DNA sequence: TGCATCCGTGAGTCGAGGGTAATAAGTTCTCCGAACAAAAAAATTCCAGTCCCGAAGGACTGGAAGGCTCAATCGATCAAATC
């Protein structure tokens, strides 16, 4: 099996258990690889970060789960990768130049 | 015209048990023919013997293709704090 098939399955791996408390080290058990072999191969194809990749969409899916539902932000930290809200809001201001609170108020 | 003659008829099945018996010659003499014999094929059963893409199979050569340790240094995790 060539390597361009695996990252097609690696992105067919991730988007189904984002509401789960998921990490990179369980991907390496499911893909059988080591913990380090995931992060070299993503740069030949995407030229982005795969360590922050599973952390990017826990903003992007909390950009619709907070947006559609009436969920408050202090349960997003304990499940979607963090421990407190003071770090979750900072990753948003580097990505899309916004704060989480005034992200919904903009119709 | 009888009178005298004769042909052609008569319920249906189960059965229950099988078929007799009379007297009747001899001689030689001789071709028509049998099955056993006893060969003479011809037909099969047997037995090794050369050919040929495959025949269980090993190896080879060849490009491809592979797993996970570290370490300067990035970025962000953690956790007191703080508007």
Q: Is the CB of A5 under 7 A from strand B?
A: no
Chain A 12..51 CB hits on strand B (< 7 A): 32-37, 40
What is the spatial distance between Cα A85 and Cα A103, in angstroms, rounded to a whole number? 15
Q: Is A81 left (phi over 0), alpha (psi -120 to 50) or beta?
A: left
Q: What kind of experiment solved this structure?
A: cryo-EM
The nucleotide minimizing the C1' distance to residue A82's CA is B77
Read off the DSSP letter of residue A42: H
Angle between helix A85-95 and A53-60 (nearest 10): 90
Joined together, the tokens standing for residue A51 give 């360590």
∠ at Cα A47 (A86, A88), nearest 5°? 10
Structure resolution, Å? 4.2
- CA A102 to chain centroid: 21
End-to-end CA separation in angstroms for chain A: 47
Scanning A1-107, the segments in alpha helix (DSSP H) are 3-14, 24-30, 37-45, 53-60, 62-68, 76-79, 85-95, 101-104
The nucleotide minimizing the C1' distance to residue A56's CA is B76
Q: With beta carbons less than 8 A apart as the criterion, state whether A77 and A86 touch.
A: no
Å: A1 CA to B61 C1': 23
The nucleotide minimizing the C1' distance to residue A91's CA is B76
């Amino acid at each position: 099996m060539s390597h361009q098939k695996i990252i097609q399955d690696l992105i067919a791996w991730i988007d189904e258990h984002i509401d789960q408390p998921l990490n990179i080290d369980v991907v390496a058990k499911k893909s059988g690889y080591s913990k380090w072999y995931l992060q070299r191969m993503f740069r030949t194809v995407t030229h982005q970060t795969l360590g922050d990749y599973i952390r990017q969409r826990r903003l992007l899916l909390a950009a619709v789960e907070l947006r559609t539902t009436e969920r408050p932000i202090f349960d997003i930290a304990m499940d979607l990768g963090y421990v407190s809200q003071q770090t979750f809001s900072r990753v948003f201001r580097r990505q899309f130049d916004r704060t989480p609170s005034d992200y919904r108020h903009r119709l």
